Amino acid sequence: DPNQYYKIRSQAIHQLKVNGEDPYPHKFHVDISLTDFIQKYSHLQPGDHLTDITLKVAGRIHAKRASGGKLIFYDLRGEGVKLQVMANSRNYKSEEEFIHINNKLRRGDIIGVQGNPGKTKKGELSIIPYEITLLSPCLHMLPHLLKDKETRYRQRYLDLILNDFVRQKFIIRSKIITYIRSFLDELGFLEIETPMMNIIPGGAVAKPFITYHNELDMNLYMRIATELYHKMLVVGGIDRVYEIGRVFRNEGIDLTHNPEFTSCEFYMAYADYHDLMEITEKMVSGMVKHITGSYKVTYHPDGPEGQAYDVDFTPPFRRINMVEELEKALGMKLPETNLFETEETRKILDDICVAKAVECPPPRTTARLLDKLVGEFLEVTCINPTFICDHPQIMSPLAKWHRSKEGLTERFELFVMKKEICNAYTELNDPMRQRQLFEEQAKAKAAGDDEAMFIDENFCTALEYGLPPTAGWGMGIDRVAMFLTDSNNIKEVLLFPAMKP
Amino acid sequence: DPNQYYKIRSQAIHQLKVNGEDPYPHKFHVDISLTDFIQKYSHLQPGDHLTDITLKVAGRIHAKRASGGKLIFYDLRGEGVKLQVMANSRNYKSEEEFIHINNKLRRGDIIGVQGNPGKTKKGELSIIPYEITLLSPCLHMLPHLLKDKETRYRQRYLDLILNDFVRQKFIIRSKIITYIRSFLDELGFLEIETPMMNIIPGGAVAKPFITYHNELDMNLYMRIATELYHKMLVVGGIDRVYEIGRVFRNEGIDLTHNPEFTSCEFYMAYADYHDLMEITEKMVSGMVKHITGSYKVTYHPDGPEGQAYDVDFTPPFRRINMVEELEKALGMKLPETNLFETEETRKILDDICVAKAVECPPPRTTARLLDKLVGEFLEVTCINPTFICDHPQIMSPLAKWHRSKEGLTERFELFVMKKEICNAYTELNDPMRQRQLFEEQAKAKAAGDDEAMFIDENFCTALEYGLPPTAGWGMGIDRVAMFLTDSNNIKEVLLFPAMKP
Amino acid sequence: PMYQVKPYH
Amino acid sequence: PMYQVKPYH
Ligand SMILES: C[C@H]1CCC[C@H](C[C@H]2Cc3cc(O)cc(O)c3C(=O)O2)O1
């Protein structure tokens, strides 16, 4: 029946074209927005009809209801709001035109309306048309009712038309990005753009996208992060930089992951991870308060059907040291942090993982065992925003060695609702040590699997001209958007998410 | 010797870190930036030394000049500005440490400085150090005379260190982008992000980048434009949208072209190309006026050694009709605009092209002949911002047909300095006509032109739910940056431009 | 001149 | 708190 509807309406509109009545007109002049109309004329009393005021508005019809002889009501929606069109032949240009145009229109059609402000006896604010013009027809039957998520994500326009909360979600996302921009700009950061196509991918650990460049006759990688370019620009004498942009990591698609996602990375000269911790506190708390109205926000991890938790963004955020509180959570003392790269301590952690029933699929290496243990005993501890700090060097090849702690680095991750929204550390500015670490993990790549980073010689060369003491920071924009929109699925905060049929 | 310099300095720093003197300290606390240090203490008279004021500053040493013995001068640069460090042995914490730190430092080194504000007898504002700390060494000999483009582009950090005007250029670029964002935000546009990886590339004419996805067994294309997604969002009920983002077109690399470049596209419901023409006028004129302080900008197309033109951005911009004024410039009468797809018209354009000695390499089509002809007789007359309007349908598959003019479309291009910075048109909202034009493009793709558009069924399906009358717009950001930075090469406005091996 | 719509921010 | 740098805008 909806198929039959599509055929019939298509035929009808096509014949409107043949008959030269122009179902798709070029220009309609809108005098006032639906929002402005609503708030301007909301003061009207029921029964009011202003004949002195004539306005032109436009929108999409979500409903058509007829008293059926001379009277037809249209529910006209747009801008996330609604306005009633009360059409009676008495107030129309003429009865004949009334009949014609009403026989032409259907639910879902985009129409312009020229008429007068008024209010019905029922007290509903309405516009009483002098003339209605079809701006563009809807050839498909709209759902009565669009609950199925796959259908929502595959056709986003339907979701935006039918579901009002979607608009608010993406508005919130935009507000987040713009807020971050305002923050960093006001802090004296320069907004920059760095190559999204690299010869050597770097800045993070991920499986890259590969593409071919025609004129240069070579393969290039899509960026997994903006880190190295930014640091090279800090070398260039630009002290504070930031980029909010798309990052490509070719990996599994799930609730927290999308192959392409938006990240914000900034780099600040003469700063360390402490300073960036404070800045992160102020930025995140200020963002949440500005957008949501307060420091506390309600979030449903399992969805509306499940339990809701209160996330408190009130600063300062709680800080935990990875190794220490891992020891305290395990009820076991771990090895000294300077011993973390020996096979021995790795074996110890193997025993601890099998003793605590923490699963670590092959390869079982110290880094991944640590990741699983921290994930199990620590990451789950974070509901409110929480700093996990002082990661071991083995987990942080790009991070500067911890000043007071041997074997560790100066680094922190920000966790909200058990998920990681932020990664930051004091940047390693020593070219020799950096190239050394790079070469260790390159030696791992030669040791027979591809996870480990590739060596960037240009970046180390840049480090040889020297890098001022610098701290650096990055944030998943999509996940933050998820938490501020109360979404447990990343596809909710992405306009046209990647889909697997 | 620069090589030997590298060796020696490398060894020196190496045994420095061996001896545990920490050439790469973690944190230096900067009290005040160089800029407002200058602002604050510029009022000082020559000979002044303020002993009760102690400040910490940081920067890169661009020069080292000894007065011999107890006195040595450092040129400390950063933030595009300059501060002299006058190090006097008697004013240092001690003579011994003075000696020690002075023998350690080299030109190019990143240093912190703790000392008193003052001014030399020569009248130079200076800081007189209590202690100088090496924040990070420069292991390479820094250039003396970087005036050559390629070296500047391949290492951007050197270019930024040595050349201030580069920093100023990218500052200008940032200012442009932020200005556009503000302009569109305040007009009620929603800043959005659309997929940069698509199933079928569209929205423009170009050779795509191809990549593989490691989840879905399918291949994917990098976007050549954001158009279709934006229009689909307008269909969704979001009336005003814009995206400033990266766009990929795999093609030749020249002065006006880079494989990846930044574009800004906005789509406005109920607007036509006239509206967009005036909005473009005020946006561009206002941008130029805000950034440069005036409506008129001096530009060198051939470079600083060539002739300069004055570009007048004073609104309104000159409007020109393509076919009409092409007839004016040719001194000949062109076939009526309804006949343009005729092979007879193609032959006429051919004879006109060969009569005017306008070269059009194969394949020779009505559209290519017309494009080269317009490029020769029209685009060259655009110095000031100029609108070229009412393109034929054959040159504009996505543009809505001209309301009063048979065979043409409602479209304009904005030309500055003979180059196209903008492309905009009244959007075609008719799904049947759109699918048909896509059919023509498809047939022409399977035989003729290979950068020709592919049919997008999802987009047409979206058009079937209806698209309100809408005007689309787009702008090359990099070219605008070129014109506002007085650059004849796009590589100038790109931080890390694509370079051939 | 197009009709006025309140900024999202 | 880090030292203040004037906005580029
Ligand atoms: C840039 C980093 C900083 C730390 C948090 C967050 C992690 C990042 C990981 C990541 C990987 C991936 O393949 C797809 C994704 O959407 C994400 C993500 O959203 O978050 O962003």
Ligand SMILES: C[C@H]1CCC[C@H](C[C@H]2Cc3cc(O)cc(O)c3C(=O)O2)O1
């Ligand atoms: C999106 C469009 C709209 C019209 C102006 C401008 C055209 C664009 C053409 C273009 C093609 C290409 O292959 C590489 C490039 O760097 C550019 C460019 O900078 O300008 O941007």
